[PDB]
Amino acid sequence: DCDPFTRRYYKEKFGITDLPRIDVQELPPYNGFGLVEDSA
Amino acid sequence: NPHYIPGYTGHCPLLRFSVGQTYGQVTGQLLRGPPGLAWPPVHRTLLPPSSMIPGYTGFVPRAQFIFAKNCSQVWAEALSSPYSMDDRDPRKFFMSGFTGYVPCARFLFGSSFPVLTNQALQEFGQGHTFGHLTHDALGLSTFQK
Amino acid sequence: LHYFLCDDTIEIKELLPALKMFLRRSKLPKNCPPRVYQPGQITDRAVLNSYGDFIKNQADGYLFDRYKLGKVDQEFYKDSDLSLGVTINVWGRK
Amino acid sequence: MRECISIHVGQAGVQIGNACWELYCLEHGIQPDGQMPSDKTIGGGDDSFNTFFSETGAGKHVPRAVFVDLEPTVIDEVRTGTYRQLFHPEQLITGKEDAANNYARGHYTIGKEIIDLVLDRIRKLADQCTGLQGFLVFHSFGGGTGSGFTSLLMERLSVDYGKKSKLEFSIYPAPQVSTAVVEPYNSILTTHTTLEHSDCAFMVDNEAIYDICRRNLDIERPTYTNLNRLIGQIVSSITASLRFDGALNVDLTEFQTNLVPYPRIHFPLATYAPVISAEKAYHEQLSVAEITNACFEPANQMVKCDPRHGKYMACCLLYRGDVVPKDVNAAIATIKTKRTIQFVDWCPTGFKVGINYQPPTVVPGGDLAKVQRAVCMLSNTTAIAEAWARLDHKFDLMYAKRAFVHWYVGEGMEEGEFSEAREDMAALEKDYEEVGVDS
Amino acid sequence: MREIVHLQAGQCGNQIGAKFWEVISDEHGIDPTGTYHGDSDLQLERINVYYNEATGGKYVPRAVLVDLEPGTMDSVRSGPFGQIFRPDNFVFGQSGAGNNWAKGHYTEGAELVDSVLDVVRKEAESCDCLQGFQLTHSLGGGTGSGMGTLLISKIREEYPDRIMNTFSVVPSPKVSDTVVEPYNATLSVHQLVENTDETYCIDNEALYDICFRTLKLTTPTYGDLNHLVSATMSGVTTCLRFPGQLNADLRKLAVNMVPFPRLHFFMPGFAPLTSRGSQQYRALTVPELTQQMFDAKNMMAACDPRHGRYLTVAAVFRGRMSMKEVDEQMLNVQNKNSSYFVEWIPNNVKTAVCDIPPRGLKMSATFIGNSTAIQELFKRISEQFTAMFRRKAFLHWYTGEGMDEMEFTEAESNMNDLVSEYQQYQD
Ligand SMILES: Nc1nc2c(ncn2[C@@H]2O[C@H](COP(=O)(O)OP(=O)(O)OP(=O)(O)O)[C@@H](O)[C@H]2O)c(=O)[nH]1
Ligand SMILES: Nc1nc2c(ncn2[C@@H]2O[C@H](COP(=O)(O)OP(=O)(O)O)[C@@H](O)[C@H]2O)c(=O)[nH]1
Ligand SMILES: [Mg+2]
């Protein structure tokens, strides 16, 4: 990447506008005793 | 950028009053701007940005006044502070330990120096009955009262 | 507010619900609270120069001129300016 | 990570330091707010500002300088100036009443009250430094604070800190141009403790820089804003090597050893070149062979003295910008062939050179021109004997009738201290005569 | 930050001080009511020096008003800026002084000073750090000469380490308006030379000559005469209230200008004075101002400095100016007038430059002079004393209320001790 000032020098002089900002558990099953809320 | 070369000995308007700068930028500032007096004048001398042969003895009109140039040429020319800031400005404060006076600052209490100076700058810029409550508790409880 | 017609100067008293003389006998300025002008600039008469001859009377030895050069303009309250029901800025007091 | 501490006491020390930190913010591209800009990029290292600044984790830089004065009238300019958001709010220490151009009112009565707050800030600063190198104290001889508050601060700091070199940049009284009336008194009383706790005290004055401001710059009427911008560049040319890289860099410790031949002879003079305006720089060619012959002229020393009468003792050239070492070498051998420039016999090697790779800077709205290079001269010579001869001729003519004495006595100074300080300069004037004679 | 207490007693001292508080109120933009109305913010950072904040954004001065007569106290309330003062500061007796020194210092002035000094110590105790005292009086009266030395004696016995600004109007040879002026003058210098750090001497006949030569006033009344003293009054202490470039407070003038404990009587001055006509013809520069300082006709005392020598000169500049032209022009004037300045003191002249000039002018300057020529002011008073003391005239009005003949010989011996020092150092 490059700074904003470097992007200013590249459009007034070379006449190009290049701005690419390139970047770089489930619960166990129920057994069968009690309630499903109590065992959980 | 019109100016005078250093070492110039002529007169410049307001040259004797301006301080702390060289002759160059003092003269460069003074040339362009009039202020109290008149600007440098409109006609500025200073600071710049034939059917006859020679030997002819006849009369050519208004040729005795033109000079310094040859016979054919003269024939050719003969024929031709935080106080001034707004209240909404975040810079309206004084840093810690400022000796200088701030109006309406001695009357405030229980605040730090920046908050107190900001407030000072802004100011300078600008039951019912015991019997009724505890009686008839049976119908309307103490929470109801 | 007293206003002597012979002198056009104003003295002011007070009536307590007296503190005597509120403002002294002087020509009341009209526009704004005026700044104190530098001394020697408030002369009634203008003079080119005094007499170069060393023998001279101090009150009599002045040559007056025809040009009002450094004259400070001042407006003063008079009987024509103030009438019944007009605001007056008494040294800043409206 | 090579560090320095700059203390500014008195009015002259503080007011020059207002123009020193003028420069360092724009050398390294730091805004007055303390935040580096986001749009513009400058050429400057992350260790380049570490000599004179400190990086705070919010990305705001803070100076390493302590501002002390006994009178609040000058410090309050800085607190409400353009650099309010720059300094530490505790670093600016405020007194109550000044020294009144009295030595004993800054060393015995008022100067004892805040000396614990002054030294504790130096203790707080030095513990933050990773590696320390020295001190740069700014004051003046003739004042009551620059003589008073300098005297006790550097005598307690030498006790606390053992072998760190101290570099004092003090304003010498001029021979003719002088402001106060107690200048011959306040200058003698400082030097009774400079000789024991100051290793190198660079010295400038007011009349020589006035005349330099007239011939070279062509300024008809100079203020104090003009002088502080010129002294602000010499100090930025001495501490250039710790911030930038070059060919042969000079260390703050080493030129303490190249410039002090005897333990009592440590008073050099500063000189900067090429000091020129904007109309003459574009016309001339300012090469290496001529910016160093400008330094050796009798009219270009920044102290009102004649260097022809004395003989030089030890020199030190400090270059900057685009310079190659060979042009410096031929520019030195052409100087030793000159007959007016006289060196002592016992010191055949006297010159020393240092080269940096950064050109000088210019402040917007300034007076100095944009030049490719610069040279700073720091000359130790025996010509200051005549400078201190006339000042001791001021002392005895006033001490003969005991004028102005009782203002000193009324604060705590004994009368007997006046005689002992005069006998110190009695010996020091004989030292330049003892050193200067050729064996 | 530095706090100054102002006192005024006597008719000549009351009216000049009332003209003093009028100038500085406009300088800092204070309305006659006490409300701040100004243009620049630099006038407000140091406002605690002269003024005290009241509740509601109203300002009051630090002045103590004392007289033995109620006549002039009604006049100060009746002035153009008279409403600003504190009604708790108006302490006064009811019996007139009668132009008598003993009626202000021993008989009737001994009952009022208990409540006079109580108001003074109430104002100074509210201050955080006090600097000094400024008092206005006249040397020839019965109040200002009697009570002037009474109050400075009692203040210094309780504030030892301070500075005293005694602004005294001295008697005049031709403009003498009381027959007992030699009696009232010699009776106050016994306490002025002992208990005053610096005294500024003002006569009446040099102020008329300034009003007739430099200013060319046709009718120089008392309203314009006291304003001349008022400008030098407010010009000496500009470095304590306004920012500057070479600052110098009141004790700095104490060190530079007092070489001996009893040579401290200063001649004052003002420096941009001009007539009304030639405002457009005068070039306002530092070389024009410096010639206006050392003119023989521009100081405010009845002494010719050409008849003596100079010990120490200090001049406080104001406005935007350079310092080379200040430092060279106050070195050129010392070298050209080499005979006048003494040879046993080098660098007689002390300069000071501020940054805010007064309103209505681009720059200004205040001149202060210590000279040996002030011995002529004390010589004529001493020889006027002898011709009246020889025949014991006008003496029973003094000896009839406690004073004795033995006090008169001691005071005249002190003038002879004081005037001998200037002549001794001259050669
Ligand atoms: N070149 C230069 N000299 C200065 C400056 N400020 C003060 N001086 C010199 O300092 C000398 C006396 O010291 P001052 O600065 O006036 O006073 P001080 O040293 O602060 O001592 P105090 O007044 O007691 O606080 C004067 O003779 C001036 O020549 C300045 O900004 N630039
Ligand atoms: N310049 C000036 N002098 C004054 C004024 N009022 C009185 N004097 C002088 O004071 C002298 C007399 O002092 P006096 O009033 O008797 O002192 P007091 O009795 O203590 O009040 C006279 O010679 C006058 O010239 C004044 O308003 N301005
Ligand atoms: Mg100071």
HEC readout, chain D: CEEEEEEECHHHHHHHHHHHHHHHHHHCCCCCCCCCCCCCCCCCCCCCCCCCEEEECCCEEEECEEEEECCHHHHHHHHCCCCCCCCCCCCEEECCCCCCCCCHHHHCCCCCCCHHHHHHHHHHHHHHCCEEEEEEEEEECCCCHHHHHHHHHHHHHHHHCCCCEEEEEEECCCCCCCCCCCHHHHHHHHHHHHHHHCCEEEEECCHHHHHHHHHCCCECCCCHHHHHHHHHHHHHHHCCCCCCCCCCCCCCCHHHCCCCCECCECCCEEEEECCCCHHHHCCCCCCHHHHCCCCCCCCCCCCCCCCCCCCEEECCEEEEECCCHHHHHHHHHHHHCCCCCCECCCCCCCCCEECCCCCCCCCCCCCCCCCCEEEEEEEEECCHHHHHHHHHHHHHHHHCCCCCCHHHHCCCCCCHHHHHHHHHHHHHHHHHHHHHCCC
Report the DSSP beta bridge partners of residue D3.
D132
DSSP type of residue C76: B
Q: How many CB atoms lie within 10 A of CB D298?
A: 11
- Euclidean distance between CA atoms D192 and D171, whole angstroms: 17
Dist. CA D102–CA D104, nearest whole Å: 6
What whole-number distance in Å separates Cα of residue D373 and Cα of residue D274? 8
Identify the three-state secondary structure at position A39.
helix
Is any atom of ligand 2 closer than 6 Å to the C-beta of E225?
yes
Q: The tokens of D35 are what? A: 């935040």
> Subunits with at least 3 CB pairs below 8 A relative to chain E?
B, C, D
One-letter amino acid at D400 equals A
* Structure tokens belonging to residue D211: 């005349």
The answer to whether residues E303 and E336 belong to one domain is yes
Cβ contacts of A3 on chain D, cutoff 8 Å: 39, 41
Q: How far is CA D137 from CA B13, D168, D230, D231, in A?
A: 44, 5, 17, 14
E103 and E228 together in one domain: yes
C-alpha B142 to ligand 1 mean position (Å): 79
Q: Could you tell me if E281 and E166 lie in one domain? A: no
Q: Which residues of D are catalytic?
A: 254
Q: Within 10 A of A9 (CB to CB), how many other CB atoms are there?
A: 11
Tokens of E427: 């050669």
Q: Testing the interface with D: which of B23, B84, B85, B91 to mutate, by most D Cβ within 10 A?
A: B23
**Phi-psi category of residue E90: left, alpha or beta, with phi > 0 → left and psi -120 to 50 → alpha:** beta
Nearest CA in chain E to D94: E1
Which residue among D8, D140, D181, D411 is best mutated to probe the pocket of ligand 1, counting the most ligand atoms within 8 A of its Cβ?
D140
Backbone angles phi, psi at D382, to 5 degrees: -95, 5
- Specify whether E379 is located in the same domain as E332: no
Instruction: In whole angstroms, give the CA distance from residue D165 to residue D135.
Output: 7
> Residues followed by a break in chain C, C–N over 2.5 Å?
17
Q: Are residues E33 and E159 in the same domain?
A: yes
D227 lines ligand 1 (CB under 6 A): yes
Kindly state whether residues E86 and E161 are assigned to the same domain.
yes
Q: Is D101 in the pocket of ligand 1 (CB under 6 A)?
A: yes
Give SS3 for B131.
Answer: helix
Least Cα distance to D58 among D39, D30, D81, D36 occurs for D36
Residues E277 and E132 in one domain: no
Q: Tell me how far apart the alpha carbons of residues C71 and C44 are, in angstroms, rounded to a whole number.
A: 9
Question: Is any Cβ of chain B less than 8 angstroms from the Cβ of E286?
Answer: no
Structure tokens at B58: 């006849």
User: Is any Cβ of chain C less than 8 angstroms from the Cβ of E174?
Assistant: no
DSSP C93: B
Provide the residue type at D249 as one letter: N
Q: Please list, in sequence order, all residues whose beta carbon lies within 8 angstroms of the beta carbon of residue A11, skipping any fewer than 6 positions away.
A: A17
HSE-up of residue E132 (Cα within 13 Å, Cβ side): 18
Q: Is residue B28 within a helix (H) or strand (E), and if so which, with residue range?
A: helix B23-32
- D180 in contact with ligand 1, CB cutoff 6 A: yes
Q: Please report which ligand is nearest the Cα atom of D105.
A: 1
Element (H, E) at C12: strand C10-12
Query: What's the Cα-to-Cα distance from C9 to each of C2, C27, C42, E79, E81, rounded to whole Å?
Result: 8, 5, 17, 14, 17
Contact D6, D136 (CB under 8 A): yes
This structure's resolution (Å) is 3.6
Contacts of C69 in chain E (CB under 8 A): 276-277, 279-280
Chain position carrying tokens 């001490």: D399
Name the interface residues of B facing E (CB cutoff 8 Å). 16-17, 19-20, 81, 83-84, 99-101, 103-104, 106-107, 124
Same domain flag for E237 and E126:
yes
The CB of D170 under 6 Å from ligand 1? The reply is: no
Q: Are C42 and C24 in contact (CB under 8 A)?
A: no
Q: Which residue ranges of D are tagged as binding site for GTP?
A: 11, 71, 140, 144-145, 179, 206, 228
Give the Å distances, CA to CA, from D412 to D1, D110, D149, D193: 43, 11, 15, 18
Cβ-based neighbours of C37, under 8 Å, separated by 6 or more: C72, E360
Instruction: Measure E329 CA to nearest chain D CA, in Å.
Output: 10
Q: CA angle, corner D74, sides to D72 and D78, nearest 5?
A: 105
**Cα dihedral angle (E35, E41, E43, E44), rounded to 10 degrees?**
60
N-to-C CA span, chain D: 45
The residue with tokens 């605040």 is: B111
Helix (H, G, I), strand (E, B) or coil at B115: helix
Alpha-carbon gap, residue B21 to D219, rounded angstroms: 6
Q: What is the DSSP letter of B138?
A: T
Nearest CA to ligand 1 atom 5: D12
D57 alpha carbon, distance to own chain's centre: 33
The values of phi and psi at residue E266, to 5°, are: -100, 145
Query: Closest by alpha carbon to D385, among D341, D429, D419, D355?
Result: D429
Domain count, chain E: 3
Residue D173 C-alpha to ligand 1 middle, in angstroms?
10
**E312 annotated ligand binder:** no
Give the domains, in start order, of chain D with CATH numbers. Answer: 2-268 (3.40.50.1440), 269-383 (3.30.1330.20), 384-438 (1.10.287.600)
Smallest Cβ–Cβ distance between B24 and the set D84, D223, D279 belongs to D279
Strand D165-171 with D131-140, pairing: parallel
Same domain (yes/no): E308, E350: yes
- Cβ neighbour number for residue B35 with a 10 Å cutoff: 9
State the Cα torsion B95-B100-B102-B106 to the nearest 10°.
100
Name which of D150, D166, D148 is nearest D158 in CA terms.
D166
CA-to-CA dists, residue E303 to E203, E274, E377, E416, angstroms: 10, 22, 7, 18
CB D323 within 8 A of CB D403: no
Give the end of a domain, one of E374, E390, E413. E374
Q: Which atom of ligand 2 is nearest to the CA of E202?
A: 1
The three-class DSSP label of residue B13 is coil
How far CA E277 is from CA of C53, E221, E297, E358, in Å, comes to: 21, 20, 19, 21
- Say if residue E393 is in the same domain as residue E246: no
Q: Please classify residue D126 by burial: count the beta carbons closer than 10 Å to its beta carbon, then call 0-12 exposed, 13-18 middle and 19+ buried.
A: middle
- Nearest bound ligand to CA D111? 1
CA of D105 to the centre of ligand 3 (A): 12
Q: Which of D361, D254, D373 is nearest to D316 (CA)?
A: D254
Beta bridge partners of C90: C93
Pick the last residue of a domain from E257, E283, E318. Answer: E257
CB B3 within 8 A of CB B15: no
Angle at CA of residue D263, ends D259 and D264, nearest 5°: 100
Is there a single domain that holds both residue E272 and residue E361?
yes
Under 8 Å between Cβ of E237 and E354: no
Whether residue E10 has its Cβ less than 6 Å from ligand 2: yes
Token duo for residue D226: 């003009």
Give every CB contact of residue B18 below 8 A, 6+ residues apart in sequence. B26, B29, B30
Angle at E48 between CA E44 and CA E51, to 5 degrees: 95
**E141: annotated binding-site residue?**
no
Q: CB neighbours of B107 closer than 8 A, spacing ≥ 6? A: E55
The greatest distance separating any two alpha carbons of chain D, rounded to the nearest whole angstrom, comes to 67
- Position D342: which residue type? Q
For residue D189, the Cα-to-chain-centroid distance in whole angstroms is 19
Structural contact between residues E141 and E184, judged by C-beta atoms closer than 8 angstroms: yes
Q: Are E407 and E106 in contact (CB under 8 A)?
A: no
CATH of the domain at E51: 3.40.50.1440
Q: Do E228 and C70 touch (CB under 8 A)?
A: no
How is residue D181 written in tokens?
């009336």
CB-based contact (8 Å) between E287 and chain D? Answer: no
Q: Report which of E188, E130, E127 is spatially closest to residue E159, judged by C-alpha positions.
A: E130
Task: Please give the sequence-ordered ranges of beta strands (E in DSSP) within B11-136, or none if there are none.
Answer: none
Residue E17 in contact with ligand 2 by CB distance below 6 A: no
CB contact under 8 A, D100 and E351: no
Atom of ligand 1 nearest to the CA of D180: 27
Protein residue with its CA nearest to atom 3 in ligand 2: E12
Return the bridge partners of E349, or none: E313
Q: Which of helix, strand or coil describes residue B132?
A: helix
Tokens standing for B67?
A: 């000079």
- Residue E307's closest CA among E381, E383, E382, E372? E372
Q: Judge whether E337 is annotated as a binding position.
A: no
- The CA distance from C76 to C8, in Å, is 9
Closest of E113, E178, E173 to residue E141, by C-alpha: E178
Identify the burial level of B70 via C-beta atoms within 10 angstroms of its C-beta, where 0-12 means exposed, 13-18 middle and 19 or more buried: exposed
From CA D432, how far away is CA D426, in angstroms rounded?
Answer: 11
Q: E252 contacts in D (CB within 8 Å)?
A: 98, 100-101
- What is the C-alpha separation between E310 and E259, in angstroms, rounded? 12
**Smallest Cα–Cα separation from D436: which of D338, D347, D357, D318?**
D347
Cα–Cα dist C74/C30, whole Å: 8
Tell me the C-alpha distance between E151 and D192, whole Å: 44
3-class state of residue B74 by DSSP: helix
Q: Kindly report the CATH number assigned to the domain that includes residue E333.
A: 3.30.1330.20
Decide: D200 and D316 in contact? Cβ < 8 Å: no
E25 and E57 belong to one structural domain: yes
- Which amino acid appears at position D288 of this protein? V
Distances (CA, A) of D393 to A1, D261, D303, D388, E207: 70, 27, 19, 9, 41
Phi and psi, residue B51, nearest 5°: -95, 30
E48 interfacial to chain B (CB closer than 8 Å): yes
How far is Cα E79 from Cα E32, in angstroms, rounded to an integer? Answer: 10
Establish, for the pair of chains A and D, how many residue pairs have beta carbons separated by less than 8 Å: 8
Tokens 């007038």 belong to residue: E337
Question: With contact defined as beta carbons under 8 Å apart, do E318 and E358 qualify?
Answer: yes
C33 interaction partners in chain E (CB closer than 8 Å): 31-32, 37
> How far is C-alpha D263 from the geometric centre of its chain's CA atoms?
19
SS3 B24: helix
Q: Is E147 in the pocket of ligand 2 (CB under 6 A)?
A: no
| Residue E308 burial (CB count, 10 A) | 18
Alpha-carbon gap: C59 to the closest alpha carbon of chain E (Å)? 7
**Residue C12: beta bridge partners?**
C23
Rounded CA Rg of chain E: 21
| E65 to C19, E4, E9, E70, E368: CA distances (angstroms) | 17, 15, 7, 11, 27
Quote the minimal CA–CA distance from C69 to chain E in Å.
6
Query: Which is nearest to E171 in space by CA: E382, E407, E402, E324?
Result: E382
Taking the C-alpha atoms of residue D225 and residue D15, their distance in angstroms, rounded to an integer, is 9
Tell me the C-alpha distance between D413 and D379, whole Å: 36
Q: What angle do CA C30, C33, C37 make, to 5 degrees?
A: 95
Contact D39 A5 (CB under 8 A): yes
Are C70 and E279 contacting, i.e. CB atoms less than 8 angstroms apart? yes
Tell me whether residue E143 is annotated as binding. yes
Q: How far apart are CA E17 and CA E25, in angstroms?
A: 12
Q: Cβ distance E155 to E6 under 8 Å? A: no
Closest among D403, D389, D156, D369 to D275, alpha carbons compared = D369
| Structure-token pair, residue E324 | 């080379």
Which amino acid, one-letter code, is at D77?
Answer: E
Residue E274 belongs to domain spanning: 265-374
Query: CA E346 to CA D184: how far, in whole Å?
Result: 9
Q: How many CA atoms lie within 13 A of E79 on its CB side?
A: 22
Structure tokens at E327: 């430092």
Instruction: Please give the torsion angle defined by the CA atoms of residues B11, B13, B14 and B20, in that order, rounded to the nearest 10 degrees.
Output: -60
- Cα E421 to the center of its chain, rounded Å: 23
Question: Any idea which residue has 């160093």 for tokens?
Answer: D292
Q: Which residues have CB under 8 Å from E406's CB, separation 6+? A: none
* Ion ligand 3, residue ranges at CB < 5 A: D 11, 71, 98
Query: Would you say E330 and E290 are in contact if contact means Cβ atoms under 8 Å apart?
Result: yes
Query: What spacing in Å lies between the alpha carbon of E384 and ligand 3's midpoint?
Result: 46
SS (H, E, C) chain E: CCEEEEEEECHHHHHHHHHHHHHHHHHCCECCCCCECCCCHHHCCCCCCCEEEECCCEEEECEEEEECCCHHHHHHHCCCCHHHCCHHHEEECCCCCCCCCHHHHCCCCCCCHHHHHHHHHHHHHHCCCEEEEEEEEECCCCCCCHHHHHHHHHHHCCCCCCEEEEEEECCCCCCCCCCCHHHHHHCCHHHHCCCCCEEEEECCHHHHHHHHHCCCCCCCCHHHHHHHHHHHHHHCCHHHCCCEEECCCHHHHHHHHCCCCCCCEEECEECCCCCCHHHCCCCCCHHHHHHHHCCCCCECCCCCHHHCCEEEEEEEEEECCCCHHHHHHHHHHHHHCCCCECCCCCCCEEEEEECCCCCCCCEEEEEEEEEHHHHHHHHHHHHHHHHHHCCCCCCHHHHCCCCCHHHHHHHHHHHHHHHHHHHHHHC
* Nearest ligand, CA D140: 1
Domain end marker among E229, E257, E285: E257
Nearest-angstrom CA–CA distance, D411 and D109: 7
Window 298-327 of E, Cβ < 8 Å to D: 312, 322-325, 327
Residues 6+ apart with CB under 8 A from B144: none
Looking at the complex, does the CB of residue D69 fall below 8 Å from at least one CB of chain E? Answer: no
